[PDB]
């Protein structure tokens, strides 16, 4: 595995120095082996 | 062809069952509703007889 350090100290800070929330993804999502994008067809005929 | 046609009730089954339990809690909301008038007017009559016995206790 891997250990993360780039943004761990980004969010333990003061004020708005921790990053704002990401916007809602309205595009390709890269979760896992599938794509699981939005507005997909439920089943092929 | 035979295998694709049969499987059509996996999203269809969810529509009946999401309905049917929640009229029971509506019923439970209902059977506690007339519980409330059977309770609120049962203590008004308690107030009434206490007020009816209020001067008669003298």
């Amino acid at each position: 595995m891997q250990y993360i350090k780039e943004y761990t100290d980004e969010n333990i800070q003061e004020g708005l120095a921790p990053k704002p929330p990401p916007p809602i993804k309205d595009s390709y999502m890269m979760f896992g082996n599938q794509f699981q994008c939005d507005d997909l067809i439920i089943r092929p005929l | 062809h035979v295998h694709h046609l049969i499987n059509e009730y996996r999203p269809h089954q969810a529509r009946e069952t999401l309905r049917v339990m929640m009229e029971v809690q509506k019923r439970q909301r209902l059977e506690t509703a007339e519980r409330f008038q059977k309770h609120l007017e049962r203590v008004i009559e308690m107030i009434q007889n206490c007020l009816a016995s209020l001067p008669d206790d003298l």
Partner: protein, 37 residues
Amino acid sequence: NHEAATCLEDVVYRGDMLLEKIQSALADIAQSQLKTR
């Protein structure tokens, strides 16, 4: 189910204004017997 919330909350409010009155009707005679001592 929307109106069941409204029909339930209205008799709740009938309980609310009634309990607020009689708890005060409890209270006004509740501290009254303190000063009787």
